[PDB]
Design a protein around this nucleic acid. Structure first.
Length: 140
RNA sequence: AAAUUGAAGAGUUUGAUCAUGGCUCAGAUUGAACGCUGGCGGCAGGCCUAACACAUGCAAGUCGAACGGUAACAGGAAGAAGCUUGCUUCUUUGCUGACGAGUGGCGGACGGGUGAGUAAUGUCUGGGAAACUGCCUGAUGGAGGGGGAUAACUACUGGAAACGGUAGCUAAUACCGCAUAACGUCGCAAGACCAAAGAGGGGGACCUUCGGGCCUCUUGCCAUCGGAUGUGCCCAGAUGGGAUUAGCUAGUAGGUGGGGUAACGGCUCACCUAGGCGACGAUCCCUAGCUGGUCUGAGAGGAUGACCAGCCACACUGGAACUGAGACACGGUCCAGACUCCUACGGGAGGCAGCAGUGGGGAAUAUUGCACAAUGGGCGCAAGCCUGAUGCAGCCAUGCCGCGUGUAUGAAGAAGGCCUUCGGGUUGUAAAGUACUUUCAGCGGGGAGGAAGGGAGUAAAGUUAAUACCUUUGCUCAUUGACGUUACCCGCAGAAGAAGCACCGGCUAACUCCGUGCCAGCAGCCGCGGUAAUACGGAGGGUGCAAGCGUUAAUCGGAAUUACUGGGCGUAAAGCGCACGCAGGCGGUUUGUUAAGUCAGAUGUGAAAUCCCCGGGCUCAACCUGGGAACUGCAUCUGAUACUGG
RNA sequence: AAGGCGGCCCCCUGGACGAAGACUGACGCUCAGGUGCGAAAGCGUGGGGAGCAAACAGGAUUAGAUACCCUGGUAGUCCAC
RNA sequence: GAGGGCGCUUACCACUUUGUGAUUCAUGACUGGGGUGAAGUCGUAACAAGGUAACCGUAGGGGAACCUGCGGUUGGAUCA
RNA sequence: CGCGGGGUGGAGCAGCCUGGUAGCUCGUCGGGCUCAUAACCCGAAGAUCGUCGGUUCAAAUCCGGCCCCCGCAACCA
C-alpha cells in the first residue's frame, strides 16, 4: 500500500497495525519506481546451477533396503556434501535430478567426501544405476 | 346536533379428502435507497451510518443616562488662515454628536445541537415538607458621614508570537470601615448584631466660588414581609430482558451527638445498636434516554419514540471547583489524557453533538445564501445595537395535495405494424384533415397583505412653583418588507414546451405470433424451459398505475400462527416414569364484625399540539385555524356491604 | 403410586374395601423449587454359576454373509452391599 | 498588632502502575459431526409377515445401512 | 560352506511325530436351476506324495543325500 503523498487516518491505523501489512509513502516518483521493481526482482526464484561443489563418477552399484540403491562412487574433483543439490547425467544429457539424502562411505556415514577418496552415495526416487555416468553436485 | 356507530380471505403437503401446521400473497405505513422515467406549484421532510475527525466565515452581546476618558470621524471655537472677505483648511483645545481600548453593570445558566451515559440524585401518574429564587410585582421604611486602592494612561524594559516586568498616576453605581437598625437574624427573655449609590430631563423668585446650589419629576441602590415564575428535596405505583446470574450489603440499616446544606436526610464524622435488601426477583449480566404521542389493528393488542412539544442527560475524554440568584458552565477557568495548529525553537494556541461547509464511513440525506421586515430573546430611558433563535430563499419527485401535458369533430374505418383458417379482424376516432380553447411554462403590463410600531411636531390630562421635563391618550405630516420578478389581476404568441413504469400461467385485472429447446433464462408462493412455451427473450395486442412506476429494505395486519379478549396436549408439536411435599394458587356451610379488593358519588388533576365532531380561512385540496368531545388514567374524601380478603 | 409383584410355610410390615355407630371440627385440593421411589442393560468389591447367552471361536448358507441356522462359549443373567 | 495572601502540611480524589482472577467478541494449523446438491460406488436396513415382525431403552460387535444379547411396547401380518 | 519353512493333481492345501488304495478347495470339462446369464446345486476328469539310497509286512507320512521354491537372512553404500 503506497501513496505519492498520504497520511494515515485514525480508523486506518487500527486495521494496518492489526493485520500484517505495509504502509510506505514516497515523496518522489523515482524512489517509488525503483522499489516496485525491487519488489518484482525479489519475487523471482531462479537456480541456474550454481557452481559445482564436486563432480563424481559412480561404479559398482550396491543394493540398500531404504533408498533402494547405493551407487559406489569415486570423486574426481571437488568435495561432495550432504544437503547440496545434485545433477545426475549420462552421456552429457541429464538422466535424473535431485538433492542428496544420504552420503555414506563404509559404515562411517560421513557428511563430506573429498576428491580421489573412495565414496558412497544413495538417493530416493532413483531407480536405475548404470556405470559410466557422472553425478554433478553443486552448491547454491 | 355530532364527536371508536366496527371486524372478508387466497395459493401451497394428497391420486383425491378432512384435520393439523408452517411458508407465501392481496392492505395500510416509511426521515428511505436503487433501476427506468421525469413539466409546474402549495405544504411538509431531509446524516437513520462514525457521541468519527474537522480548514474558513458566522452563531453573545450591549449601556457614554455608572466611570476616568479621547484614538478614530464629525462638527464646532479664542486663534492660526484657506482668503477670490463668509465659502473656508490646520495648528490647537473632548467644547459635543459620537466612540477604539479600559474599569463598572446586566447578559455569556437563555435561545440552538445531540442522545453518548443512565433500568434510576431519570421519566410518567399522584401526592408530600424541611427550601432558595436575577429580572417583573404589592407593602413599609432607608438612602447619613468617611477611607485606602486600581485598570486605562505615563516612563523604562523582556518576547518571534501569546502575552509580560518595574515604578509612577487617577475615576466610579469597583472595593472597605464608621454611623443609623426592625414587622430582620440569634436569644425564654433581658439584650446583642446586620445595609446602601448614584445617574439623568426640565426650571420660577433668590444668589454666589458660574461648577451648580435650591425647585421638581424620572430612574437605579439598601432592608424586611409577601405575590408570580423558576429550581432543589422526599414518598407510592408504574416504566425492558436474562436464574445457562440466588444470594447481596461496613456508611452497610438504624440510634445518639457534633459538623454540614438554601433546606430534610449516613450528607459527613465519632460513638452505640446489628441491622438493611432479596424468589412480589435482590445482587450480577445484556440492552436502553422517558413521555405526550406515532404506525398498525374492529378491538384487545403488536411495533415504535425523526420532524412538533414536555422532562432528563451530555458539550473532545477523565476529574475539579471558581464566579454567580442560577453552572459544577455548549462557543468560561484549572489539572490530567488523546489529538491538531503556529514558532524566529526558546515557547504558544484550540475543541462544530450551533448554522453553512470539508474529509471519512455509508445504499443514502441539501447552500460555506438573504434579512432582522415580522414574531421572540439579550442590553439600553430611548434611539438603537446584537440575535445561523426566527422569518425566508437554494438543493433533492422524499412524501402529501392540487393542476397540466389539450377540447370537439373526424371512416369503409387510409398507410404501416400485428393476427388470420386470406373471407377478414385489430391497432383505431387513434393518426392525418377540420375547426376551437390557452390553465401551466414563456413574455410584457399592473399590484394586496404579512406594518404593529418608531420619528418630528401638536393638543388634553395626571405631575409640579410652573404652560418645563416626564408619562398616557387622541391629531396631522413624512416614513419602515429579507422574501420579491410575492399572492392575485390584465395583455401577447401559438397545441404550441410537457408520458413514462410495471404487469398480462393460477393466486390476480390483462393473449397471441415468432425465436429458443432442461439451453439462454424466469421465479413473492405453486412452478415454467427437451419442437404448438399465453410462464424464457422480442414483437403486436391488452391490463393496472401515472410524474411517477417498479425492485429492495422495514413495522403492524391478515396470523385465532403466544390464543386477556381468543388455542391446544389418546393416535397430528405437547401429561414430568411414579409418589410425598414447603412456598404459592384455590377452598365446603352459618352468624357477627371489618371495609383492603369490588361498587357508587363528589372534588382535584390528566400541559398544549395530535386523533375525532361541527364550523372558519387560503380559487380547491393538502395546509392553517375557532369551539367541542375525548384523554377509557391517577389521587383524595364520603358512602354502599352482595361477592372476595381480614 | 409407578417401576413392577406368582411353589409352600412362618415372622416383621404398607395400602384398599365393607358394616355399624362414636369422636375431631374444613384439619381440604393442587404443587414450581426440594426429597424419595424407579424395568432391563451397564458399573465397583466379594461371593455364586445348572440353564440361557452379548463378545469371541469353529461349522454352514451366500455373489459376499463381520448376519439370520448349527456346535461351543466369556461377561451377564443369581446373592450381599 | 488583628486579619489576609504565598509557601509548607494533612484528608478526599482523576490519570497511572503492579500482581492475580472472572467474563465476552474476534481469530487459529487441524479435527468432529450437521445441512445442501442432476447424476457416482457398495450393499438393501425400513415400508407387505418387507422375506429374521418392527420399534424403545441399554450394552457389545461390525465397511455401511445394521447384527446380536437383555428387558419393555403394539404403533405386529397370520391363527389355519 | 549361512539361518526359516515347504515340494501331492492345472494352481494352492489336508492327510503330520498318530507308517496300510491320496482327499479337500479354486480352476478344467459336463450336467442341473433360469425365458436367458450371472450366482448357485449334482458330477466326473485330474498324481512315481520332488527326486534317490535306506528301511519294511505295507512307509504319503519313515532318515539322510541330490535338488528346487519361498522366508528373512543378503548385494548390508
Amino acid at each position: 500500500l503506497v501513496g505519492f503523498n498520504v497520511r494515515a487516518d485514525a480508523s486506518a491505523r487500527k486495521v494496518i497495525e492489526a493485520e500484517s501489512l505495509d504502509l510506505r509513502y514516497y515523496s518522489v516518483i523515482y524512489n517509488l519506481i525503483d522499489e516496485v521493481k525491487a519488489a518484482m526482482s525479489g519475487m523471482l526464484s531462479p537456480e541456474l546451477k550454481q557452481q559445482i561443489i564436486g563432480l563424481a563418477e559412480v561404479r559398482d552399484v550396491f543394493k540398500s533396503p531404504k533408498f533402494g540403491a547405493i551407487a559406489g562412487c569415486m570423486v574426481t574433483e571437488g568435495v561432495v556434501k550432504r544437503h547440496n543439490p545434485i545433477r545426475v547425467l549420462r552421456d552429457n544429457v541429464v538422466i535424473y535430478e535431485g538433492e542428496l539424502e544420504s552420503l555414506r562411505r563404509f559404515k562411517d556415514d560421513v557428511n563430506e567426501v573429498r576428491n580421489g577418496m573412495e565414496c558412497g552415495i544413495g538417493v530416493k526416487n532413483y531407480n536405475d544405476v548404470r556405470t559410466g555416468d557422472v553425478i554433478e553436485v553443486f552448491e547454491i
